[PDB]
mmCIF file of all heavy atoms in Angstrom:
data_model
loop_
_atom_site.group_PDB
_atom_site.id
_atom_site.type_symbol
_atom_site.label_atom_id
_atom_site.label_comp_id
_atom_site.label_asym_id
_atom_site.label_seq_id
_atom_site.Cartn_x
_atom_site.Cartn_y
_atom_site.Cartn_z
ATOM 1 N N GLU A 47 -15.707 78.414 -61.219
ATOM 2 C CA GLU A 47 -16.196 77.071 -61.517
ATOM 3 C C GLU A 47 -15.335 76.003 -60.852
ATOM 4 O O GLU A 47 -15.860 75.021 -60.313
ATOM 5 C CB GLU A 47 -16.245 76.855 -63.030
ATOM 6 C CG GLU A 47 -16.904 75.554 -63.459
ATOM 7 C CD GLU A 47 -18.411 75.668 -63.566
ATOM 8 O OE1 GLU A 47 -18.944 76.772 -63.327
ATOM 9 O OE2 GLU A 47 -19.064 74.653 -63.888
ATOM 10 N N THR A 48 -14.011 76.179 -60.880
ATOM 11 C CA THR A 48 -13.119 75.193 -60.277
ATOM 12 C C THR A 48 -13.310 75.121 -58.767
ATOM 13 O O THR A 48 -13.340 74.028 -58.188
ATOM 14 C CB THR A 48 -11.666 75.523 -60.618
ATOM 15 O OG1 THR A 48 -11.501 75.539 -62.043
ATOM 16 C CG2 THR A 48 -10.728 74.487 -60.018
ATOM 17 N N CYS A 49 -13.442 76.277 -58.109
ATOM 18 C CA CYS A 49 -13.632 76.290 -56.661
ATOM 19 C C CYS A 49 -14.936 75.612 -56.266
ATOM 20 O O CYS A 49 -14.990 74.887 -55.264
ATOM 21 C CB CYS A 49 -13.600 77.727 -56.138
ATOM 22 S SG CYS A 49 -11.957 78.478 -56.069
ATOM 23 N N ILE A 50 -16.004 75.845 -57.033
ATOM 24 C CA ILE A 50 -17.300 75.250 -56.716
ATOM 25 C C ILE A 50 -17.226 73.732 -56.820
ATOM 26 O O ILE A 50 -17.705 73.005 -55.943
ATOM 27 C CB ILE A 50 -18.391 75.828 -57.634
ATOM 28 C CG1 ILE A 50 -18.655 77.294 -57.283
ATOM 29 C CG2 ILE A 50 -19.672 75.015 -57.520
ATOM 30 C CD1 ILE A 50 -19.454 78.032 -58.331
ATOM 31 N N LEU A 51 -16.614 73.230 -57.894
ATOM 32 C CA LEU A 51 -16.465 71.789 -58.056
ATOM 33 C C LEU A 51 -15.453 71.200 -57.084
ATOM 34 O O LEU A 51 -15.574 70.025 -56.720
ATOM 35 C CB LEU A 51 -16.068 71.464 -59.495
ATOM 36 C CG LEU A 51 -17.118 71.824 -60.549
ATOM 37 C CD1 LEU A 51 -16.586 71.584 -61.951
ATOM 38 C CD2 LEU A 51 -18.398 71.035 -60.315
ATOM 39 N N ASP A 52 -14.461 71.985 -56.656
ATOM 40 C CA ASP A 52 -13.485 71.500 -55.687
ATOM 41 C C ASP A 52 -14.094 71.347 -54.299
ATOM 42 O O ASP A 52 -13.632 70.513 -53.512
ATOM 43 C CB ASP A 52 -12.283 72.449 -55.641
ATOM 44 C CG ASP A 52 -11.121 71.893 -54.835
ATOM 45 O OD1 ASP A 52 -11.215 71.850 -53.591
ATOM 46 O OD2 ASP A 52 -10.110 71.497 -55.451
ATOM 47 N N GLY A 53 -15.128 72.122 -53.987
ATOM 48 C CA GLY A 53 -15.764 72.075 -52.688
ATOM 49 C C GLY A 53 -15.305 73.126 -51.703
ATOM 50 O O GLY A 53 -15.711 73.072 -50.537
ATOM 51 N N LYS A 54 -14.477 74.076 -52.130
ATOM 52 C CA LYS A 54 -13.987 75.110 -51.233
ATOM 53 C C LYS A 54 -15.103 76.094 -50.891
ATOM 54 O O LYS A 54 -16.064 76.273 -51.642
ATOM 55 C CB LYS A 54 -12.808 75.848 -51.868
ATOM 56 C CG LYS A 54 -11.563 74.989 -52.040
ATOM 57 C CD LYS A 54 -10.419 75.776 -52.661
ATOM 58 C CE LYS A 54 -9.192 74.899 -52.856
ATOM 59 N NZ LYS A 54 -8.067 75.649 -53.477
ATOM 60 N N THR A 55 -14.966 76.732 -49.731
ATOM 61 C CA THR A 55 -15.947 77.707 -49.281
ATOM 62 C C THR A 55 -15.716 79.049 -49.975
ATOM 63 O O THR A 55 -14.813 79.207 -50.802
ATOM 64 C CB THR A 55 -15.893 77.855 -47.761
ATOM 65 O OG1 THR A 55 -14.709 78.570 -47.388
ATOM 66 C CG2 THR A 55 -15.890 76.490 -47.093
ATOM 67 N N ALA A 56 -16.556 80.030 -49.637
ATOM 68 C CA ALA A 56 -16.433 81.352 -50.246
ATOM 69 C C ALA A 56 -15.112 82.013 -49.878
ATOM 70 O O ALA A 56 -14.452 82.617 -50.731
ATOM 71 C CB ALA A 56 -17.609 82.233 -49.827
ATOM 72 N N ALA A 57 -14.706 81.912 -48.611
ATOM 73 C CA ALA A 57 -13.448 82.511 -48.186
ATOM 74 C C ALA A 57 -12.247 81.635 -48.514
ATOM 75 O O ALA A 57 -11.109 82.108 -48.420
ATOM 76 C CB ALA A 57 -13.484 82.803 -46.688
ATOM 77 N N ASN A 58 -12.470 80.379 -48.891
ATOM 78 C CA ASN A 58 -11.390 79.460 -49.222
ATOM 79 C C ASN A 58 -10.986 79.514 -50.689
ATOM 80 O O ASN A 58 -9.999 78.875 -51.067
ATOM 81 C CB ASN A 58 -11.787 78.027 -48.853
ATOM 82 C CG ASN A 58 -11.662 77.755 -47.369
ATOM 83 O OD1 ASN A 58 -12.473 77.031 -46.790
ATOM 84 N ND2 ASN A 58 -10.646 78.334 -46.744
ATOM 85 N N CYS A 59 -11.717 80.251 -51.521
ATOM 86 C CA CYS A 59 -11.386 80.382 -52.934
ATOM 87 C C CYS A 59 -10.601 81.670 -53.151
ATOM 88 O O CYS A 59 -11.091 82.763 -52.843
ATOM 89 C CB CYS A 59 -12.648 80.371 -53.794
ATOM 90 S SG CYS A 59 -12.327 80.414 -55.575
ATOM 91 N N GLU A 60 -9.388 81.541 -53.679
ATOM 92 C CA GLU A 60 -8.528 82.686 -53.945
ATOM 93 C C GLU A 60 -8.713 83.121 -55.394
ATOM 94 O O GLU A 60 -8.619 82.298 -56.310
ATOM 95 C CB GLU A 60 -7.067 82.336 -53.665
ATOM 96 C CG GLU A 60 -6.087 83.483 -53.864
ATOM 97 C CD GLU A 60 -6.283 84.603 -52.858
ATOM 98 O OE1 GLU A 60 -6.558 84.302 -51.677
ATOM 99 O OE2 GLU A 60 -6.148 85.783 -53.246
ATOM 100 N N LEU A 61 -8.983 84.406 -55.597
ATOM 101 C CA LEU A 61 -9.163 84.948 -56.936
ATOM 102 C C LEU A 61 -7.914 85.698 -57.376
ATOM 103 O O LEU A 61 -7.243 86.345 -56.567
ATOM 104 C CB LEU A 61 -10.369 85.885 -56.990
ATOM 105 C CG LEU A 61 -11.688 85.364 -56.422
ATOM 106 C CD1 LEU A 61 -12.691 86.499 -56.323
ATOM 107 C CD2 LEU A 61 -12.234 84.234 -57.275
ATOM 108 N N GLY A 62 -7.608 85.603 -58.666
ATOM 109 C CA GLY A 62 -6.517 86.363 -59.239
ATOM 110 C C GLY A 62 -6.976 87.720 -59.727
ATOM 111 O O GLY A 62 -6.471 88.235 -60.730
ATOM 112 N N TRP A 63 -7.944 88.306 -59.026
ATOM 113 C CA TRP A 63 -8.496 89.595 -59.417
ATOM 114 C C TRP A 63 -7.583 90.720 -58.946
ATOM 115 O O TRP A 63 -7.195 90.769 -57.774
ATOM 116 C CB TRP A 63 -9.896 89.772 -58.834
ATOM 117 C CG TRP A 63 -10.527 91.082 -59.185
ATOM 118 C CD1 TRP A 63 -10.678 92.169 -58.373
ATOM 119 C CD2 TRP A 63 -11.105 91.440 -60.447
ATOM 120 N NE1 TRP A 63 -11.310 93.184 -59.053
ATOM 121 C CE2 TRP A 63 -11.582 92.761 -60.329
ATOM 122 C CE3 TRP A 63 -11.263 90.774 -61.666
ATOM 123 C CZ2 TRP A 63 -12.207 93.425 -61.382
ATOM 124 C CZ3 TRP A 63 -11.883 91.435 -62.710
ATOM 125 C CH2 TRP A 63 -12.347 92.747 -62.562
ATOM 126 N N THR A 64 -7.248 91.626 -59.858
ATOM 127 C CA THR A 64 -6.377 92.753 -59.571
ATOM 128 C C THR A 64 -7.155 94.056 -59.692
ATOM 129 O O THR A 64 -8.295 94.075 -60.165
ATOM 130 C CB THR A 64 -5.174 92.779 -60.519
ATOM 131 O OG1 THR A 64 -5.634 92.860 -61.873
ATOM 132 C CG2 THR A 64 -4.349 91.516 -60.355
ATOM 133 N N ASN A 65 -6.530 95.145 -59.250
ATOM 134 C CA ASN A 65 -7.152 96.457 -59.366
ATOM 135 C C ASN A 65 -7.324 96.817 -60.836
ATOM 136 O O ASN A 65 -6.359 96.816 -61.607
ATOM 137 C CB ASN A 65 -6.302 97.508 -58.643
ATOM 138 C CG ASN A 65 -6.982 98.866 -58.564
ATOM 139 O OD1 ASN A 65 -7.310 99.477 -59.581
ATOM 140 N ND2 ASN A 65 -7.194 99.347 -57.344
ATOM 141 N N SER A 66 -8.558 97.121 -61.225
ATOM 142 C CA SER A 66 -8.904 97.409 -62.610
ATOM 143 C C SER A 66 -9.823 98.620 -62.663
ATOM 144 O O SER A 66 -10.642 98.821 -61.760
ATOM 145 C CB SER A 66 -9.580 96.203 -63.265
ATOM 146 O OG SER A 66 -9.969 96.495 -64.594
ATOM 147 N N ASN A 67 -9.688 99.418 -63.719
ATOM 148 C CA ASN A 67 -10.579 100.550 -63.904
ATOM 149 C C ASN A 67 -11.968 100.066 -64.323
ATOM 150 O O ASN A 67 -12.231 98.867 -64.451
ATOM 151 C CB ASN A 67 -10.008 101.524 -64.934
ATOM 152 C CG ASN A 67 -9.581 100.837 -66.211
ATOM 153 O OD1 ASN A 67 -9.358 99.628 -66.234
ATOM 154 N ND2 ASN A 67 -9.460 101.608 -67.285
ATOM 155 N N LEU A 68 -12.868 101.028 -64.526
ATOM 156 C CA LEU A 68 -14.296 100.813 -64.758
ATOM 157 C C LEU A 68 -14.971 100.092 -63.599
ATOM 158 O O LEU A 68 -16.121 99.655 -63.740
ATOM 159 C CB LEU A 68 -14.574 100.050 -66.059
ATOM 160 C CG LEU A 68 -13.760 100.399 -67.305
ATOM 161 C CD1 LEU A 68 -14.063 99.412 -68.421
ATOM 162 C CD2 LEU A 68 -14.035 101.822 -67.757
ATOM 163 N N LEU A 69 -14.287 99.950 -62.461
ATOM 164 C CA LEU A 69 -14.837 99.321 -61.261
ATOM 165 C C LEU A 69 -15.315 97.896 -61.528
ATOM 166 O O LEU A 69 -16.261 97.418 -60.898
ATOM 167 C CB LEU A 69 -15.966 100.165 -60.663
ATOM 168 C CG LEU A 69 -15.534 101.199 -59.621
ATOM 169 C CD1 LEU A 69 -16.738 101.765 -58.884
ATOM 170 C CD2 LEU A 69 -14.538 100.592 -58.642
ATOM 171 N N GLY A 70 -14.663 97.202 -62.455
ATOM 172 C CA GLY A 70 -15.038 95.841 -62.791
ATOM 173 C C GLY A 70 -16.391 95.730 -63.469
ATOM 174 O O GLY A 70 -16.774 96.592 -64.257
#
């Protein structure tokens, strides 16, 4: 939500997503 309102592109938004089981 913050990236969309900030105006950043798809590759310009950094996610804090880490390796997780159940394949997300």
Side-chain angles (χ1 to χ4, degrees):
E47 187 85 1
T48 301
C49 285
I50 290 166
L51 296 175
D52 190 287
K54 293 181 181 179
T55 73
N58 282 143
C59 184
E60 182 67 39
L61 309 169
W63 180 256
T64 59
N65 188 300
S66 178
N67 50 340
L68 319 173
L69 270 192

